[PDB]
Subunit: 250 residues, 3 copies
């Protein structure tokens, strides 16, 4: 059956004064991340392996050497038998002030390479229009599970799942206050199942309460099997974040 | 019939955050710091019960961010309680300044590992009994071998093993003089066996001799199979490190 | 096995101005690791078989000033037994601004072949012949697990990023200044690159504006054990010289 075009978001932080990350992210790494979220989008859509057949021309603007939360969004925009066109936007917002500094657009042509006994007959589903989704104040972000983050049993270290949750807590906090934030504490976190190597994590993070200088952020962590689509809630965490100038008023 | 009881050993994992590295600083005193706390817990657990472990849960943790200078950060883990399958591991994260060796932070975390045994005699697996260690009176760090450090034959690149020895050399030298140090030369290093992906490396580094500005450090590298416990000495190296302000009096 | 000429393999890494972590590791343990990695590549290309590092001769290091550097790691085989390969590695650091050579560390690596297969116990390394000295940047890197998907294929994004790195190297060497990416053209991929392979980038300056340069990059894959190469992609990147834009 036909499928609606979902938006997939992948978020990376460049900290103030990190010239290496800055220089690579507004550079080749920036490119790599655009392709990664393209890849994820495609795979979620067709539930089959994909490669990047081609990448359309891209214009880059380098912002000022400040710090940024950088969001990569992907949407499938056209779909053949095996060619998927994916549109990717790269938006950088200052950590301090939340000013949009870049807005690069790329177009990726993914191609499905199906495996299995019935692969001679794989097609992509009819693409239909993405529904305008009633906005959340909640950050929803994905990332792939990398071999370095997994043990030899193929399982993501929970510490590495925790760190992703914290990343999401940093994003939501910082977006809320318009300032740099720092982790002050994290509550008990229980894991319902272990996360596997062939999966994406999805973190959802939003501000629960606001003190004078701190917030409390809830994060929910899901895993999703790329090829099958199987999702499970994995963990819920609560982090306390403090706004900084030295602590500041939120 | 009955696994013999085991003394709770302390496992140490050490990471350097260099002066002015705002990205590492911001992640380490943050989510990455979490992830490392988990990793050293995971090693400790695995050494104890010689079986696969997962993280079932993580108790609340409080964090304090030190000044943006440079730090040697040590993550120690002890098992503190042991059921049939539950292992409680206590982790301490301590950051000392590279310049001056002043303790700036001291966060404690409690990790609840659970064994997931594999094999025919899986259903019958019990954890050993835990005795307390005897608190004893030269640096000793472990780290896991990551896929990115290994070739397609599953063997760690010797270069990567050398780097780890150098990291240990830096830790010892720097602790000794209380200043930042740099590598000046390394001596012939011969490798007795190749290190494999499912193993941890263990470095032991201490100061051999002290010049006016310089210092010699011997490092010994071991590998240890996480599940079996098989250890072998792998390499011995000698690095010269120089104290720096530009060269300084050690 | 017929005799083989000793090729030079080059691996390049950039340390940006002000990156004290990379600086502190690269002029240190990481530098070491890279010298070994390129040695390993050279060996594997020569003998087309698995290799380990049996030993590493003494190395002297000099720390340059905390500025930024393009760092080049070159490896040549220099002696070849039945199973022992001696590889010579040079680590040269040039300033990004000004292109001054600041370091020049030499290392000697003893690789040993560990052949696999049916006629394994009978494997000898092919004979070593000296290459003629050759008359544009070529660089190789291994494809790491983290750059590949669960099907064993390098992400095309990761391929692109390598090409961009090569573009940066060529541009920056050309103008003697720091450069930044301004745009990339359409890039088409001929085949997917696999985990057990190296990528090889060739990059050179095509045309020069006042502040811009356009760089062509060609990407190849090579199977380490078989030697099978294929052209993978060709890209065109525009780079801009910087002080804020500057005169090339
Ligand atoms: Na990695």
């Amino acid at each position: 059956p036909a499928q609606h075009g979902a938006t997939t978001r992948l978020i990376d932080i460049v900290f103030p004064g990190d010239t290496n990350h800055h220089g690579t992210l507004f550079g080749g790494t920036g490119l790599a991340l655009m392709d990664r979220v393209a890849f994820i989008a495609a795979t979620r859509f067709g539930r089959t392996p994909f490669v990047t057949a081609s990448c359309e021309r891209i214009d880059f603007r380098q912002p000022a050497r400040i710090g940024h939360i950088v969001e990569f969004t992907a949407r499938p925009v056209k779909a053949g038998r095996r060619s998927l066109t994916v549109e990717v936007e790269m938006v950088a917002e200052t950590i301090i002030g939340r000013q949009q500094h870049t807005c690069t657009r790329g177009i990726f042509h993914m191609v499905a390479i199906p495996e299995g006994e019935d692969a001679a007959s794989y097609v992509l589903p009819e693409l239909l229009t993405e529904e305008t989704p009633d906005p959340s104040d909640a950050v929803t972000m994905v990332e792939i599970v990398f071999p370095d983050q997994a043990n030899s049993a193929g399982r993501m270290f929970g510490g590495e799942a925790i760190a992703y949750m914290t990343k999401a807590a940093f994003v939501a906090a910082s977006r809320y206050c318009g300032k740099l934030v720092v982790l002050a504490s994290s509550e008990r976190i229980d894991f319902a199942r272990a996360i596997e190597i062939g999966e994406i994590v999805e973190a959802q993070a939003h501000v629960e309460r606001v003190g004078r200088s701190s917030m409390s952020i809830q994060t929910k962590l899901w895993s999703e099997n790329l090829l099958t689509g199987e999702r499970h809630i994995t963990a819920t965490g609560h982090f306390t974040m403090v706004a900084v100038d030295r602590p500041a008023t939120i």
